[PDB]
Amino acid sequence: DEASAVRRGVDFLLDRREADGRWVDYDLLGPSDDWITAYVAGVLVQLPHEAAGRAGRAAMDLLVPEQHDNGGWNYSEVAPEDADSTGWVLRLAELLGRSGEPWARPGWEFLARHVHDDGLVSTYVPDLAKAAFDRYPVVPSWDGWCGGHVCVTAAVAGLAGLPRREHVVNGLLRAQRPTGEWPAYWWIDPELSTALAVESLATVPGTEPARAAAARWAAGRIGADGAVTTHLHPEGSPFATALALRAVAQGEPGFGDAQIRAAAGWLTRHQRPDGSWTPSARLRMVLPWETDPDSYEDWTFDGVGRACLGTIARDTFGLHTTATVLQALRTAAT
């Protein structure tokens, strides 16, 4: 059942490769290449399917020459390099045992430039993004985009090679809410920041209290049918359900056994006939000057080009959602 679901999701993702092996998704300003390729590849190299591992290693080979002289990678060439995309490439390298190669060093240095004094990691830095930002002079300020972002911090804190890692982990721990979750800047679903945070923190001592509190928050999000329902996905969000499953799985031994089995069953029952899940990786393109996107109520939806700012977008082709779900199904099996 779940083994079959994983196999069918792998076939969906392999069939959606570009001719050269890369994956693309989203449509904000054309699709993303480097970010999405790294993200999909990172899931595939962890699955027990030889073709998945081959495709993930092929993607790592494609990504290395795309590194910018500043050390970073990007959504696509339409965007300045950013810490999250760079972090996904370096994560793929760690998963593959390749993160000691010398091209990783300018990547670590790039990430270190995004570390704030409170320990959070920003998506962009003003000096490195200046050229791109200056192309849109009507924008009054890019300070939101250059502030510390808990979702990006949650992801990159998992890198064993991260510079200043203790400082960053401390900042991530201080951002946990008393109810156990972490907030996200770029994502509608706090399950995303929470799941990445606990998986990243599982790799560091002193974080078990935070992980136990987050697992308890996540287990309460999973309904009796296994689904995490949301305003945009009232029937159940495959993305948020998969991420809540993964956060529960970072509790203590045996914690949330029922919720994990229920969420895995819901995901298995709701897989589409083509092996994917309903696109539900809902990314909010926060306005550049906005530091508090949870307060904004006037989002548009599925905006592109000029209207991409201030919109809630989805993974147009379902690759991000499907990869996210496969990572959760692998976690449930183990």
TrEMBL record:
<protein>
    <submittedName>
        <fullName>Prenylcyclase</fullName>
    </submittedName>
</protein>
